PDB file of C-alpha atoms in Angstrom:
ATOM      1  CA  UNK A   1      -4.955 -19.675  -4.647  1.00 47.61           C
ATOM      2  CA  UNK A   2      -4.147 -16.824  -2.475  1.00 48.97           C
ATOM      3  CA  UNK A   3      -3.175 -15.984   1.000  1.00 44.98           C
ATOM      4  CA  UNK A   4      -3.571 -12.910   3.448  1.00 47.34           C
ATOM      5  CA  UNK A   5      -1.782 -12.502   6.766  1.00 51.54           C
ATOM      6  CA  UNK A   6      -1.427  -9.592   9.152  1.00 48.30           C
ATOM      7  CA  UNK A   7       1.937  -8.505  10.167  1.00 48.08           C
ATOM      8  CA  UNK A   8       2.403  -6.709  13.449  1.00 48.28           C
ATOM      9  CA  UNK A   9       5.134  -4.738  14.844  1.00 47.79           C
ATOM     10  CA  UNK A  10       7.113  -6.615  17.414  1.00 45.76           C
ATOM     11  CA  UNK A  11       7.584  -3.126  19.590  1.00 43.22           C
ATOM     12  CA  UNK A  12       6.910   0.510  19.924  1.00 41.43           C
ATOM     13  CA  UNK A  13       9.608   1.415  17.247  1.00 42.28           C
ATOM     14  CA  UNK A  14       8.609  -0.932  14.284  1.00 40.66           C
ATOM     15  CA  UNK A  15      11.983  -2.621  15.045  1.00 39.42           C
ATOM     16  CA  UNK A  16      10.448  -5.646  12.970  1.00 38.99           C
ATOM     17  CA  UNK A  17       7.316  -7.162  12.018  1.00 39.83           C
ATOM     18  CA  UNK A  18       5.836 -10.627  12.694  1.00 37.77           C
ATOM     19  CA  UNK A  19       3.205 -12.704  11.078  1.00 39.79           C
ATOM     20  CA  UNK A  20       1.824 -15.837  12.346  1.00 37.25           C
ATOM     21  CA  UNK A  21       2.505 -19.114  10.165  1.00 36.08           C
ATOM     22  CA  UNK A  22       1.255 -22.489  10.758  1.00 37.75           C
ATOM     23  CA  UNK A  23       3.611 -25.262  10.667  1.00 41.39           C
ATOM     24  CA  UNK A  24       2.864 -28.954  10.649  1.00 44.02           C
ATOM     25  CA  UNK A  25      -0.152 -31.095  11.493  1.00 40.56           C
ATOM     26  CA  UNK A  26      -1.869 -30.402  14.007  1.00 43.03           C
ATOM     27  CA  UNK A  27      -0.731 -26.669  13.153  1.00 41.91           C
ATOM     28  CA  UNK A  28       1.741 -25.197  15.443  1.00 41.51           C
ATOM     29  CA  UNK A  29       1.492 -21.484  14.978  1.00 42.40           C
ATOM     30  CA  UNK A  30       4.803 -19.434  15.216  1.00 41.28           C
ATOM     31  CA  UNK A  31       5.391 -15.779  14.763  1.00 44.53           C
ATOM     32  CA  UNK A  32       7.901 -15.454  11.994  1.00 42.34           C
ATOM     33  CA  UNK A  33       9.866 -12.315  10.604  1.00 40.76           C
ATOM     34  CA  UNK A  34       9.224 -12.289   7.010  1.00 42.48           C
ATOM     35  CA  UNK A  35      12.317 -11.150   5.384  1.00 41.19           C
ATOM     36  CA  UNK A  36      12.669 -10.106   1.532  1.00 38.44           C
ATOM     37  CA  UNK A  37      16.671 -10.107   1.983  1.00 35.71           C
ATOM     38  CA  UNK A  38      16.946 -13.700   2.929  1.00 38.20           C
ATOM     39  CA  UNK A  39      15.874 -17.055   1.616  1.00 35.19           C
ATOM     40  CA  UNK A  40      15.698 -19.482   4.449  1.00 35.27           C
ATOM     41  CA  UNK A  41      12.351 -20.423   6.541  1.00 37.21           C
ATOM     42  CA  UNK A  42      13.710 -21.171  10.104  1.00 37.97           C
ATOM     43  CA  UNK A  43      12.289 -21.654  13.567  1.00 34.38           C
ATOM     44  CA  UNK A  44      13.114 -21.853  16.987  1.00 32.62           C
ATOM     45  CA  UNK A  45      12.387 -25.538  17.863  1.00 31.28           C
ATOM     46  CA  UNK A  46      12.754 -28.364  20.302  1.00 30.70           C
ATOM     47  CA  UNK A  47      16.187 -29.001  19.025  1.00 30.46           C
ATOM     48  CA  UNK A  48      17.389 -25.419  19.852  1.00 28.92           C
ATOM     49  CA  UNK A  49      19.890 -25.323  22.663  1.00 28.98           C
ATOM     50  CA  UNK A  50      18.051 -24.724  25.797  1.00 28.05           C
ATOM     51  CA  UNK A  51      20.213 -21.960  27.106  1.00 27.13           C
ATOM     52  CA  UNK A  52      19.486 -20.021  23.838  1.00 27.59           C
ATOM     53  CA  UNK A  53      15.658 -20.301  23.826  1.00 29.75           C
ATOM     54  CA  UNK A  54      14.155 -17.483  25.992  1.00 32.34           C
ATOM     55  CA  UNK A  55      10.511 -16.977  25.729  1.00 34.93           C
ATOM     56  CA  UNK A  56      10.109 -17.837  21.946  1.00 35.95           C
ATOM     57  CA  UNK A  57       7.465 -20.477  20.847  1.00 33.65           C
ATOM     58  CA  UNK A  58       9.243 -23.573  19.479  1.00 35.59           C
ATOM     59  CA  UNK A  59       8.277 -25.777  16.418  1.00 35.26           C
ATOM     60  CA  UNK A  60       8.252 -29.550  17.616  1.00 31.45           C
ATOM     61  CA  UNK A  61       8.689 -31.650  14.669  1.00 33.83           C
ATOM     62  CA  UNK A  62       8.114 -34.823  16.422  1.00 32.11           C
ATOM     63  CA  UNK A  63       4.472 -33.885  17.313  1.00 29.53           C
ATOM     64  CA  UNK A  64       3.657 -33.096  13.675  1.00 30.55           C
ATOM     65  CA  UNK A  65       2.365 -36.094  11.867  1.00 34.47           C
ATOM     66  CA  UNK A  66       3.352 -34.434   8.376  1.00 34.93           C
ATOM     67  CA  UNK A  67       6.950 -33.699   9.364  1.00 33.51           C
ATOM     68  CA  UNK A  68       9.673 -35.748   7.778  1.00 33.51           C
ATOM     69  CA  UNK A  69      13.565 -35.140   8.375  1.00 32.70           C
ATOM     70  CA  UNK A  70      15.286 -34.048   5.251  1.00 29.93           C
ATOM     71  CA  UNK A  71      18.082 -36.380   5.796  1.00 29.03           C
ATOM     72  CA  UNK A  72      21.742 -34.987   5.760  1.00 31.41           C
ATOM     73  CA  UNK A  73      20.398 -31.364   5.207  1.00 30.10           C
ATOM     74  CA  UNK A  74      22.034 -28.634   7.243  1.00 28.13           C
ATOM     75  CA  UNK A  75      21.800 -24.852   7.296  1.00 24.89           C
ATOM     76  CA  UNK A  76      23.725 -21.947   8.526  1.00 23.53           C
ATOM     77  CA  UNK A  77      23.031 -18.423   7.812  1.00 21.95           C
ATOM     78  CA  UNK A  78      24.582 -14.946   8.924  1.00 22.01           C
ATOM     79  CA  UNK A  79      22.326 -11.556   8.632  1.00 22.72           C
ATOM     80  CA  UNK A  80      23.641  -8.074   7.791  1.00 23.07           C
ATOM     81  CA  UNK A  81      23.309  -7.000  11.505  1.00 24.72           C
ATOM     82  CA  UNK A  82      26.011  -9.758  12.519  1.00 25.19           C
ATOM     83  CA  UNK A  83      23.165 -12.290  13.911  1.00 24.69           C
ATOM     84  CA  UNK A  84      23.297 -16.180  13.005  1.00 28.39           C
ATOM     85  CA  UNK A  85      21.582 -19.309  13.411  1.00 27.09           C
ATOM     86  CA  UNK A  86      22.066 -22.961  12.110  1.00 27.27           C
ATOM     87  CA  UNK A  87      20.617 -26.124  12.319  1.00 27.37           C
ATOM     88  CA  UNK A  88      19.098 -29.040  10.444  1.00 27.76           C
ATOM     89  CA  UNK A  89      16.056 -29.373   8.261  1.00 24.22           C
ATOM     90  CA  UNK A  90      12.447 -31.164   7.906  1.00 24.13           C
ATOM     91  CA  UNK A  91       9.908 -30.802   5.172  1.00 23.71           C
ATOM     92  CA  UNK A  92       6.412 -29.990   6.698  1.00 22.83           C
ATOM     93  CA  UNK A  93       3.024 -28.437   5.757  1.00 20.70           C
ATOM     94  CA  UNK A  94       3.246 -24.618   6.028  1.00 24.42           C
ATOM     95  CA  UNK A  95       0.313 -22.244   5.746  1.00 22.73           C
ATOM     96  CA  UNK A  96       0.367 -18.467   5.737  1.00 23.63           C
ATOM     97  CA  UNK A  97      -3.080 -16.512   5.792  1.00 24.03           C
ATOM     98  CA  UNK A  98      -4.835 -19.569   4.285  1.00 21.75           C
ATOM     99  CA  UNK A  99      -2.212 -20.279   1.678  1.00 19.78           C
ATOM    100  CA  UNK A 100      -0.725 -23.775   2.161  1.00 19.23           C
ATOM    101  CA  UNK A 101       2.515 -25.183   0.962  1.00 15.22           C
ATOM    102  CA  UNK A 102       3.060 -29.091   1.545  1.00 13.53           C
ATOM    103  CA  UNK A 103       6.672 -30.250   1.581  1.00 15.25           C
ATOM    104  CA  UNK A 104       7.981 -26.773   2.596  1.00 15.90           C
ATOM    105  CA  UNK A 105      11.825 -26.894   3.855  1.00 15.15           C
ATOM    106  CA  UNK A 106      11.466 -25.880   7.773  1.00 16.81           C
ATOM    107  CA  UNK A 107      15.006 -25.403   9.022  1.00 16.80           C
ATOM    108  CA  UNK A 108      15.131 -26.268  12.634  1.00 19.07           C
ATOM    109  CA  UNK A 109      17.674 -24.210  14.786  1.00 17.61           C
ATOM    110  CA  UNK A 110      20.086 -26.060  16.645  1.00 12.90           C
ATOM    111  CA  UNK A 111      22.133 -22.732  17.501  1.00 18.10           C
ATOM    112  CA  UNK A 112      21.007 -19.132  17.489  1.00 15.69           C
ATOM    113  CA  UNK A 113      23.166 -16.008  18.194  1.00 15.76           C
ATOM    114  CA  UNK A 114      22.363 -13.862  21.118  1.00 11.41           C
ATOM    115  CA  UNK A 115      20.180 -11.230  19.449  1.00 12.77           C
ATOM    116  CA  UNK A 116      17.893 -13.840  18.411  1.00 13.31           C
ATOM    117  CA  UNK A 117      17.584 -15.488  21.994  1.00 12.79           C
ATOM    118  CA  UNK A 118      17.041 -11.822  23.407  1.00 13.48           C
ATOM    119  CA  UNK A 119      14.144 -11.142  21.205  1.00 15.70           C
ATOM    120  CA  UNK A 120      11.463 -12.987  22.457  1.00 14.02           C
ATOM    121  CA  UNK A 121       8.836 -11.876  20.024  1.00 14.90           C
ATOM    122  CA  UNK A 122      10.472 -13.384  16.874  1.00 14.49           C
ATOM    123  CA  UNK A 123      10.113 -17.273  16.685  1.00 13.35           C
ATOM    124  CA  UNK A 124      12.037 -17.479  13.431  1.00 11.14           C
ATOM    125  CA  UNK A 125      12.267 -16.108   9.933  1.00 13.29           C
ATOM    126  CA  UNK A 126      10.585 -16.525   6.244  1.00  8.81           C
ATOM    127  CA  UNK A 127      12.948 -15.717   3.741  1.00  6.37           C
ATOM    128  CA  UNK A 128      11.283 -14.204   0.571  1.00  4.03           C
ATOM    129  CA  UNK A 129      14.273 -12.962  -1.469  1.00  5.12           C
ATOM    130  CA  UNK A 130      15.269 -15.577  -4.439  1.00  5.70           C
ATOM    131  CA  UNK A 131      15.846 -19.248  -3.658  1.00  5.37           C
ATOM    132  CA  UNK A 132      19.571 -18.899  -4.888  1.00  4.16           C
ATOM    133  CA  UNK A 133      20.421 -17.385  -1.484  1.00  2.16           C
ATOM    134  CA  UNK A 134      18.977 -20.365   0.453  1.00  2.00           C
ATOM    135  CA  UNK A 135      21.660 -21.753   2.642  1.00  2.31           C
ATOM    136  CA  UNK A 136      20.555 -25.624   2.764  1.00  4.78           C
ATOM    137  CA  UNK A 137      23.349 -27.819   2.029  1.00  4.73           C
ATOM    138  CA  UNK A 138      23.781 -30.118   0.131  1.00  3.84           C
ATOM    139  CA  UNK A 139      20.489 -29.833  -1.743  1.00  2.93           C
ATOM    140  CA  UNK A 140      19.407 -26.136  -1.756  1.00  2.00           C
ATOM    141  CA  UNK A 141      15.709 -25.599  -0.716  1.00  2.00           C
ATOM    142  CA  UNK A 142      13.243 -23.146  -2.105  1.00  2.00           C
ATOM    143  CA  UNK A 143      11.364 -20.533  -0.425  1.00  2.00           C
ATOM    144  CA  UNK A 144       7.778 -20.443   0.808  1.00  2.00           C
ATOM    145  CA  UNK A 145       6.958 -18.090  -2.153  1.00  2.00           C
ATOM    146  CA  UNK A 146       8.970 -20.145  -4.765  1.00  2.00           C
ATOM    147  CA  UNK A 147       6.990 -23.292  -3.782  1.00  2.00           C
ATOM    148  CA  UNK A 148       3.488 -21.576  -3.740  1.00  2.00           C
ATOM    149  CA  UNK A 149       4.376 -19.581  -7.017  1.00  2.00           C
ATOM    150  CA  UNK A 150       2.594 -22.059  -9.518  1.00  2.00           C
ATOM    151  CA  UNK A 151      -0.630 -22.339  -7.149  1.00  2.00           C
ATOM    152  CA  UNK A 152      -1.160 -18.511  -7.026  1.00  2.00           C
ATOM    153  CA  UNK A 153      -3.664 -16.637  -9.150  1.00  2.00           C
ATOM    154  CA  UNK A 154      -0.813 -14.338  -9.971  1.00  2.00           C
ATOM    155  CA  UNK A 155       2.994 -14.805  -9.051  1.00  2.00           C
ATOM    156  CA  UNK A 156       3.284 -11.854  -6.518  1.00  2.00           C
ATOM    157  CA  UNK A 157       3.188 -11.319  -2.916  1.00  2.00           C
ATOM    158  CA  UNK A 158       2.690  -7.471  -1.621  1.00  2.00           C
ATOM    159  CA  UNK A 159       4.016  -6.071   1.718  1.00  2.00           C
ATOM    160  CA  UNK A 160       1.968  -3.231   3.252  1.00  3.44           C
ATOM    161  CA  UNK A 161       3.626  -2.658   6.680  1.00  3.74           C
ATOM    162  CA  UNK A 162       2.196  -0.108   9.142  1.00  2.47           C
ATOM    163  CA  UNK A 163       3.693   2.916  10.692  1.00  2.00           C
ATOM    164  CA  UNK A 164       3.291   2.173  14.514  1.00  2.00           C
ATOM    165  CA  UNK A 165       0.142  -0.218  13.576  1.00  2.00           C
ATOM    166  CA  UNK A 166      -0.352  -3.732  11.904  1.00  2.00           C
ATOM    167  CA  UNK A 167      -0.316  -4.359   8.194  1.00  4.87           C
ATOM    168  CA  UNK A 168      -0.661  -6.863   5.733  1.00  3.88           C
ATOM    169  CA  UNK A 169       1.329  -9.536   3.603  1.00  3.61           C
ATOM    170  CA  UNK A 170      -0.673 -10.956   0.608  1.00  5.58           C
ATOM    171  CA  UNK A 171       0.219 -13.320  -1.681  1.00  4.70           C
ATOM    172  CA  UNK A 172      -1.283 -14.202  -5.009  1.00  4.06           C
ATOM    173  CA  UNK A 173      -3.239 -10.882  -5.776  1.00  4.07           C
ATOM    174  CA  UNK A 174      -2.896  -7.381  -5.425  1.00  6.17           C
ATOM    175  CA  UNK A 175      -5.484  -5.783  -3.129  1.00  5.54           C
ATOM    176  CA  UNK A 176      -6.342  -2.576  -5.330  1.00  7.35           C
ATOM    177  CA  UNK A 177      -8.148  -0.952  -2.142  1.00  8.28           C
ATOM    178  CA  UNK A 178      -4.746  -0.821  -0.053  1.00  5.95           C
ATOM    179  CA  UNK A 179      -3.054   1.906  -2.067  1.00  3.05           C
ATOM    180  CA  UNK A 180      -3.713   5.243  -3.516  1.00  4.50           C
ATOM    181  CA  UNK A 181      -2.937   6.015  -6.856  1.00  5.22           C
ATOM    182  CA  UNK A 182      -1.180   3.875  -9.488  1.00  5.69           C
ATOM    183  CA  UNK A 183       1.600   1.303  -8.844  1.00  8.31           C
ATOM    184  CA  UNK A 184       4.809   2.195 -10.550  1.00 10.73           C
ATOM    185  CA  UNK A 185       6.784  -0.713 -11.398  1.00 10.82           C
ATOM    186  CA  UNK A 186      10.743  -0.877 -11.740  1.00 10.24           C
ATOM    187  CA  UNK A 187      13.264  -3.552 -13.035  1.00 11.85           C
ATOM    188  CA  UNK A 188      14.795  -5.841 -10.583  1.00  8.01           C
ATOM    189  CA  UNK A 189      18.327  -7.679 -10.899  1.00  8.90           C
ATOM    190  CA  UNK A 190      18.465 -11.098  -9.346  1.00  4.01           C
ATOM    191  CA  UNK A 191      22.115 -11.352  -9.897  1.00  6.08           C
ATOM    192  CA  UNK A 192      22.943 -11.205  -6.146  1.00  6.58           C
ATOM    193  CA  UNK A 193      19.650 -13.157  -4.956  1.00  4.11           C
ATOM    194  CA  UNK A 194      18.060 -10.075  -3.893  1.00  2.04           C
ATOM    195  CA  UNK A 195      14.981  -7.674  -4.955  1.00  2.00           C
ATOM    196  CA  UNK A 196      17.646  -5.268  -6.145  1.00  5.44           C
ATOM    197  CA  UNK A 197      16.370  -2.044  -8.207  1.00  5.25           C
ATOM    198  CA  UNK A 198      17.487   1.201  -8.975  1.00  4.74           C
ATOM    199  CA  UNK A 199      15.831   4.340  -7.158  1.00  2.00           C
ATOM    200  CA  UNK A 200      15.770   7.536  -9.447  1.00  2.00           C
ATOM    201  CA  UNK A 201      16.801  10.094  -6.704  1.00  2.00           C
ATOM    202  CA  UNK A 202      15.744  11.717  -3.427  1.00  2.00           C
ATOM    203  CA  UNK A 203      14.440  15.001  -1.917  1.00  2.00           C
ATOM    204  CA  UNK A 204      14.800  16.243   1.722  1.00  2.00           C
ATOM    205  CA  UNK A 205      11.892  17.821   3.196  1.00  2.00           C
ATOM    206  CA  UNK A 206      10.370  20.269   1.029  1.00  2.00           C
ATOM    207  CA  UNK A 207      13.710  20.365  -0.934  1.00  3.07           C
ATOM    208  CA  UNK A 208      14.148  20.011  -4.763  1.00  2.00           C
ATOM    209  CA  UNK A 209      14.458  16.594  -6.209  1.00  2.00           C
ATOM    210  CA  UNK A 210      17.946  15.120  -6.893  1.00  2.00           C
ATOM    211  CA  UNK A 211      17.984  13.138  -9.817  1.00  2.00           C
ATOM    212  CA  UNK A 212      20.707  10.330  -9.378  1.00  4.63           C
ATOM    213  CA  UNK A 213      20.434   6.305  -9.559  1.00  2.58           C
ATOM    214  CA  UNK A 214      20.802   4.646  -6.234  1.00  2.47           C
ATOM    215  CA  UNK A 215      20.967   1.008  -6.424  1.00  2.00           C
ATOM    216  CA  UNK A 216      19.667  -1.035  -3.568  1.00  5.22           C
ATOM    217  CA  UNK A 217      17.472  -3.753  -2.196  1.00  2.02           C
ATOM    218  CA  UNK A 218      14.119  -3.891  -0.839  1.00  2.45           C
ATOM    219  CA  UNK A 219      14.360  -5.581   2.431  1.00  2.00           C
ATOM    220  CA  UNK A 220      11.376  -5.872   4.775  1.00  2.00           C
ATOM    221  CA  UNK A 221      14.003  -7.669   7.291  1.00  2.00           C
ATOM    222  CA  UNK A 222      16.425  -4.763   7.683  1.00  2.00           C
ATOM    223  CA  UNK A 223      14.868  -2.154  10.129  1.00  2.00           C
ATOM    224  CA  UNK A 224      16.199   1.247   8.665  1.00  2.00           C
ATOM    225  CA  UNK A 225      16.847   2.924   5.364  1.00  2.00           C
ATOM    226  CA  UNK A 226      20.643   2.585   4.385  1.00  2.13           C
ATOM    227  CA  UNK A 227      21.885   4.946   1.449  1.00  4.76           C
ATOM    228  CA  UNK A 228      25.149   6.730   0.402  1.00  2.00           C
ATOM    229  CA  UNK A 229      26.847   8.690   2.836  1.00  2.00           C
ATOM    230  CA  UNK A 230      26.384  11.814   0.385  1.00  3.70           C
ATOM    231  CA  UNK A 231      22.657  11.519   0.710  1.00  2.00           C
ATOM    232  CA  UNK A 232      22.400  10.812   4.325  1.00  2.00           C
ATOM    233  CA  UNK A 233      24.423  13.887   5.145  1.00  2.00           C
ATOM    234  CA  UNK A 234      21.974  15.868   3.092  1.00  3.79           C
ATOM    235  CA  UNK A 235      19.194  14.488   5.136  1.00  2.00           C
ATOM    236  CA  UNK A 236      20.742  15.120   8.609  1.00  4.60           C
ATOM    237  CA  UNK A 237      22.277  18.584   7.546  1.00  4.62           C
ATOM    238  CA  UNK A 238      18.701  19.774   7.697  1.00  5.95           C
ATOM    239  CA  UNK A 239      18.174  18.793  11.528  1.00  5.11           C
ATOM    240  CA  UNK A 240      19.780  21.221  13.859  1.00  6.59           C
ATOM    241  CA  UNK A 241      22.116  19.329  16.284  1.00  6.29           C
ATOM    242  CA  UNK A 242      22.187  16.114  14.426  1.00 12.15           C
ATOM    243  CA  UNK A 243      25.566  14.348  13.987  1.00  8.90           C
ATOM    244  CA  UNK A 244      27.211  10.964  13.181  1.00  8.60           C
ATOM    245  CA  UNK A 245      28.451   9.356  16.394  1.00  7.82           C
ATOM    246  CA  UNK A 246      30.872   6.566  15.966  1.00 10.06           C
ATOM    247  CA  UNK A 247      30.309   5.726  19.738  1.00 13.66           C
ATOM    248  CA  UNK A 248      26.451   5.113  19.075  1.00 14.24           C
ATOM    249  CA  UNK A 249      27.165   3.687  15.691  1.00 14.77           C
ATOM    250  CA  UNK A 250      25.377   6.116  13.535  1.00 17.56           C
ATOM    251  CA  UNK A 251      23.294   9.505  13.087  1.00 18.94           C
ATOM    252  CA  UNK A 252      21.784  10.773  16.129  1.00 21.87           C
ATOM    253  CA  UNK A 253      19.780  13.812  16.653  1.00 20.06           C
ATOM    254  CA  UNK A 254      18.064  15.854  19.531  1.00 21.86           C
ATOM    255  CA  UNK A 255      14.838  14.131  20.585  1.00 20.96           C
ATOM    256  CA  UNK A 256      13.468  17.575  20.595  1.00 20.92           C
ATOM    257  CA  UNK A 257      13.719  18.146  16.921  1.00 18.07           C
ATOM    258  CA  UNK A 258      11.040  17.680  14.521  1.00 18.14           C
ATOM    259  CA  UNK A 259      12.391  15.634  11.461  1.00 14.63           C
ATOM    260  CA  UNK A 260      11.913  16.677   7.664  1.00 11.63           C
ATOM    261  CA  UNK A 261      10.297  14.095   5.595  1.00  6.87           C
ATOM    262  CA  UNK A 262      12.412  12.025   3.038  1.00  8.32           C
ATOM    263  CA  UNK A 263      11.359  11.296  -0.741  1.00  7.73           C
ATOM    264  CA  UNK A 264      12.500   8.578  -3.016  1.00  7.23           C
ATOM    265  CA  UNK A 265      12.017   8.095  -6.680  1.00  2.28           C
ATOM    266  CA  UNK A 266      10.403   4.970  -8.113  1.00  2.71           C
ATOM    267  CA  UNK A 267      10.843   5.726 -11.944  1.00  2.00           C
ATOM    268  CA  UNK A 268       9.032   9.298 -12.339  1.00  2.00           C
ATOM    269  CA  UNK A 269       7.110   8.281  -9.311  1.00  4.16           C
ATOM    270  CA  UNK A 270       7.754   9.396  -5.846  1.00  2.00           C
ATOM    271  CA  UNK A 271       7.105   7.983  -2.213  1.00  4.92           C
ATOM    272  CA  UNK A 272       7.437  10.367   0.740  1.00  2.00           C
ATOM    273  CA  UNK A 273       8.627   8.904   3.939  1.00  2.58           C
ATOM    274  CA  UNK A 274       7.259  11.253   6.890  1.00  2.84           C
ATOM    275  CA  UNK A 275       9.731  12.613   9.420  1.00  2.00           C
ATOM    276  CA  UNK A 276       8.321  10.627  12.250  1.00  2.65           C
ATOM    277  CA  UNK A 277       8.991   7.424  10.359  1.00  2.38           C
ATOM    278  CA  UNK A 278      12.697   8.416  10.691  1.00  5.56           C
ATOM    279  CA  UNK A 279      12.661   8.680  14.570  1.00  6.31           C
ATOM    280  CA  UNK A 280      13.956   5.623  16.415  1.00  3.79           C
ATOM    281  CA  UNK A 281      13.775   7.171  19.748  1.00  3.90           C
ATOM    282  CA  UNK A 282      16.199   7.463  22.633  1.00  4.52           C
ATOM    283  CA  UNK A 283      19.639   5.866  22.094  1.00  6.58           C
ATOM    284  CA  UNK A 284      19.396   4.542  25.580  1.00  8.18           C
ATOM    285  CA  UNK A 285      16.662   4.783  28.149  1.00  6.44           C
ATOM    286  CA  UNK A 286      15.925   8.473  29.215  1.00  9.13           C
ATOM    287  CA  UNK A 287      18.292  10.003  26.718  1.00 11.70           C
ATOM    288  CA  UNK A 288      17.579  13.022  24.970  1.00  7.35           C
ATOM    289  CA  UNK A 289      19.699  11.799  21.987  1.00  6.56           C
ATOM    290  CA  UNK A 290      17.473   9.943  19.553  1.00 10.83           C
ATOM    291  CA  UNK A 291      18.601   7.352  16.950  1.00 12.03           C
ATOM    292  CA  UNK A 292      18.076   8.135  13.225  1.00 12.91           C
ATOM    293  CA  UNK A 293      15.989   5.869  10.740  1.00 13.81           C
ATOM    294  CA  UNK A 294      18.057   7.143   7.923  1.00 14.27           C
ATOM    295  CA  UNK A 295      21.839   5.953   7.963  1.00 12.26           C
ATOM    296  CA  UNK A 296      24.681   5.340   5.930  1.00 11.51           C
ATOM    297  CA  UNK A 297      25.180   2.380   4.089  1.00 11.55           C
ATOM    298  CA  UNK A 298      28.822   2.879   3.578  1.00 12.87           C
ATOM    299  CA  UNK A 299      30.664  -0.358   4.307  1.00 13.14           C
ATOM    300  CA  UNK A 300      27.490  -2.607   3.395  1.00 16.51           C
ATOM    301  CA  UNK A 301      28.242  -2.877  -0.122  1.00 15.18           C
ATOM    302  CA  UNK A 302      24.807  -1.893  -1.345  1.00 17.45           C
ATOM    303  CA  UNK A 303      22.033   0.318  -0.153  1.00 13.24           C
ATOM    304  CA  UNK A 304      19.149  -1.191   1.774  1.00 12.52           C
ATOM    305  CA  UNK A 305      15.447  -0.062   1.502  1.00 12.63           C
ATOM    306  CA  UNK A 306      14.401  -1.351   4.783  1.00 13.09           C
ATOM    307  CA  UNK A 307      11.244  -1.015   6.770  1.00  8.99           C
ATOM    308  CA  UNK A 308      11.799   2.910   7.078  1.00  6.77           C
ATOM    309  CA  UNK A 309      11.179   3.147   3.271  1.00  7.81           C
ATOM    310  CA  UNK A 310       9.017   0.407   2.576  1.00  7.71           C
ATOM    311  CA  UNK A 311       6.211   1.084   5.282  1.00  2.54           C
ATOM    312  CA  UNK A 312       5.750   4.366   3.321  1.00  3.15           C
ATOM    313  CA  UNK A 313       4.474   2.379   0.329  1.00  7.53           C
ATOM    314  CA  UNK A 314       2.321  -0.464  -0.882  1.00  8.20           C
ATOM    315  CA  UNK A 315       5.156  -2.637  -2.298  1.00  5.22           C
ATOM    316  CA  UNK A 316       4.574  -5.578  -4.893  1.00  5.76           C
ATOM    317  CA  UNK A 317       7.082  -8.358  -5.231  1.00  5.92           C
ATOM    318  CA  UNK A 318       6.507  -9.386  -8.648  1.00 10.24           C
ATOM    319  CA  UNK A 319       7.781 -13.025  -9.177  1.00  6.63           C
ATOM    320  CA  UNK A 320       6.842 -13.536 -12.813  1.00  7.22           C
ATOM    321  CA  UNK A 321       9.577 -15.067 -15.280  1.00  8.43           C
ATOM    322  CA  UNK A 322      11.317 -11.450 -15.208  1.00  8.34           C
ATOM    323  CA  UNK A 323      10.726 -10.220 -11.740  1.00  8.94           C
ATOM    324  CA  UNK A 324       9.699  -6.467 -10.811  1.00 10.50           C
ATOM    325  CA  UNK A 325       9.104  -4.400  -8.155  1.00 12.35           C
ATOM    326  CA  UNK A 326       6.024  -2.113  -7.767  1.00 12.20           C
ATOM    327  CA  UNK A 327       5.402   1.118  -5.134  1.00 11.17           C
ATOM    328  CA  UNK A 328       2.628   2.802  -4.819  1.00 11.76           C
ATOM    329  CA  UNK A 329       1.671   5.418  -2.147  1.00 13.95           C
ATOM    330  CA  UNK A 330      -1.205   4.675   0.609  1.00 14.19           C
TER     331      UNK A 330
END
């Protein structure tokens, strides 16, 4: 089997991407944030504290003939941005782009943090990291990808995120028309539960490439590109007036600037992030200070190849017995 679904930016900045997902019988379609940096499929629901729901579409398990309470199971998760959610668990039929999993754990939110409430466009998350990170207790549950894997034509999914435009998540096949040149594959460590890999270096603009190992995760659920402070300083030094602002919470730059590109290495291959991808717009409405899309990972504990980086590439998440990651230009 295979599946193919379009993923759409939630706003004009590409702050996140939503993908429609069919849950239950008859189908209830919710728009979920596909997150290769976590491993829970959770949804706003009829169980979510009413004051914490503001415009989201909810899953109502009592209206699904295939929903079953997973008795005794609870979940609770915190994300890198400080957001969180928790609740109980159902199993139900879940389909993405024509690919169907029966018995998928659908984690029903009883509580969500304010950032989730305030984002009316995201109805929940669909985790695509390794199932070892799944938070369901006392019986850990599998991700949608893990449940689908054996049925897939090939044990892979791909992320093809658009810049200010829709893109595609495919399951079970590699669309050879969706990228240019060849796909370069690189080793993955699953020891922390993430799609963790080692970039071979970087360049800023038309500058020379610096060969240096950068361990990080491929995380579709993080907006920005978080890299070591040395790398980030070297990038922003090429933008007149750019500075790190403690009050704002990172690097800002004059909105009048033209940003240089940023290149990252994948083995001997190179992925170029155009400068425009690094512009996250005014820090507040009407400001002439703009927020940067490359920020320091200092204090995170790991580097994060978030959407800013991934959307410059066609990315293969290869879930074979020994997982790997592939990157192609597009």
